[PDB]
Amino acid sequence: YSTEPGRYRFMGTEAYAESIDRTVMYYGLPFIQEADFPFNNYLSMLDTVSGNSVYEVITSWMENMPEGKWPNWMIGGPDSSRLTSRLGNQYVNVMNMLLFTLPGTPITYYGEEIGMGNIVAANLNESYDINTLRSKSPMQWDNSSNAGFSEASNTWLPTNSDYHTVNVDVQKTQPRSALKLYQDLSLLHANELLLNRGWFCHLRNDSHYVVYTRELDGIDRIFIVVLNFGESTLLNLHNMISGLPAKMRIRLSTNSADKGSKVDTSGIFLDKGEGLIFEHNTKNLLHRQTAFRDRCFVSNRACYSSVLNILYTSC
């Protein structure tokens, strides 16, 4: 049923309590087609966050994957505790950014954009797993009755008690809500070739922060993503990356009040659970340098010509 153009049929597999080497086997072989990609839920298995753990997860998945394949990422699901209860509220925004800058297809569980939390366990007449009912609460739309989910007297599950201040309706007006940041990140990912395509180059591991870059050949622009997963600290980008101006302009940040502001390259101050995306104009792409050919990956390599405004393969 996948012969008609524009109607390709996707199919993926789910294997969770397994190792990475046995999981990447579902990608198939260069001459045998098995699956588009197996679903990746290693991020959703984290109960605490630090630079080292996220670095290990990302590096393991990106190294064990066959070359030229399409990765994917998840941060939650119907069988895992919701993110704001697993890791805390402060990490709600930054993780979303992490979802929208890594290469591959991101997958979002319903209610993650708003930032729902788990509900206290309750028993039902129907047979259900009480250890997983905490992540199946109804969607919160507005501050009306059963959060606007239903107009009936009783719902099949109780609604979270914080819906009076956490729902879709109220967040569409607040300019600092998580929904606005999610929409901005989605739009940026959809309207930039550097994010939906191009190289992904990661620097050395660190206990506090994770820093990586996205770039493409012939664009003369790079995105530098910096995330702080530890405590409030200070960072000097000059040591990690050479050839940067003294001042840089933030393209996007978790704290929406700092959008468009200027920061000093040596002395960036980061709070607990902060994220910055810098847009830099240069010509020294990392993946062409000799020190970083072992830490950059692509799928469907291409090069962009601005004079002709096209894409070509031979580079």
Partner 1 sequence: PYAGMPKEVLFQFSGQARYRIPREILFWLTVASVLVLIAATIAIIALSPKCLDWWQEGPMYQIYPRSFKDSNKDGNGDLKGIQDKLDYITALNIKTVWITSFYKSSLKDFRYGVEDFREVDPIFGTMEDFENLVAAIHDKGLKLIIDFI
Partner 2 sequence: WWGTSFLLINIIGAGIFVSPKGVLAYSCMNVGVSLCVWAGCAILAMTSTLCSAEISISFPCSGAQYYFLKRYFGSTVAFLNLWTSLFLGSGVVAGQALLLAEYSIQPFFPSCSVPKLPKKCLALAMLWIVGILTSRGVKEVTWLQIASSVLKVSILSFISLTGVVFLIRGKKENVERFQNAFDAELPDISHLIQAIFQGYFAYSGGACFTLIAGELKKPRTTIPKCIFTALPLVTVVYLLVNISYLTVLTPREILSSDAVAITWADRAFPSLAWIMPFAISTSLFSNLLISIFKSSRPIYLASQEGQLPLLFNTLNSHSSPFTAVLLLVTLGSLAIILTSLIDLINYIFFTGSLWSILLMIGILRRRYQEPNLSIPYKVFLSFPLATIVIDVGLVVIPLVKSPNVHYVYVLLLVLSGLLFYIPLIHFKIRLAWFEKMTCYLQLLFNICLP
Ligand X SMILES: *[C@@H]1O[C@H](CO)[C@@H](O[C@@H]2O[C@H](CO)[C@@H](O)[C@H](O)[C@H]2NC(C)=O)[C@H](O)[C@H]1NC(C)=O
Q: Which residues bind ligand X (CB under 6 A)?
A: 52, 125, 143, 205-207
When the beta carbons of 20 and 219 are compared against partner 2, the nearer one is: 219
62 lies in the binding site for partner 1 (CB under 8 A):
no
Residue 189: φ, ψ to 5° = -65, -40
Residue 85: φ, ψ to 5° = -95, -30
Residue 195: φ, ψ to 5° = -100, -45
Residues in contact with partner 2, shown as a per-residue x/- string from 2 to 41 under the rule CB under 8 A: -xxxx-x---------------------------------
Residues in contact with partner 1, shown as a per-residue x/- string from 217 to 256 under the rule CB under 8 A: ----------------------------------------
| Angstrom distances, CA of residue 220 to CA of 184, 226, 239, 241, 285 | 23, 20, 22, 16, 8
Q: Are 106 and 99 in contact (CB under 8 A)?
A: yes
Distance CA 213, CA 282 (A): 13
298 lies in the binding site for partner 1 (CB under 8 A):
no
Stretch that binds partner 1, among 19-27, 54-62, 284-292, 295-303 (CB under 8 A): 295-303
243 lies in the binding site for partner 2 (CB under 8 A):
no
Amino acid at site 145: S
Positions 123 through 162 that interact with partner 1 (CB under 8 A): 126-129, 132, 136-139, 141, 149-152, 154-157
315 lies in the binding site for partner 2 (CB under 8 A):
no
What is the enclosing helix (H) or strand (E) of 225? strand 221-228
Distance CA 248, CA 296 (A): 24
Q: Are 291 and 192 in contact (CB under 8 A)?
A: no
Q: Which residues bind partner 2 (CB under 8 A)?
A: 3-6, 8, 308-310
Contact residues toward partner 1 (CB under 8 A) are 6, 8, 10, 36, 70, 77-78, 100, 105-110, 113, 126-129, 132, 136-139, 141, 149-152, 154-157, 168, 182-183, 186-187, 189-190, 196-197, 300-302, 310-314
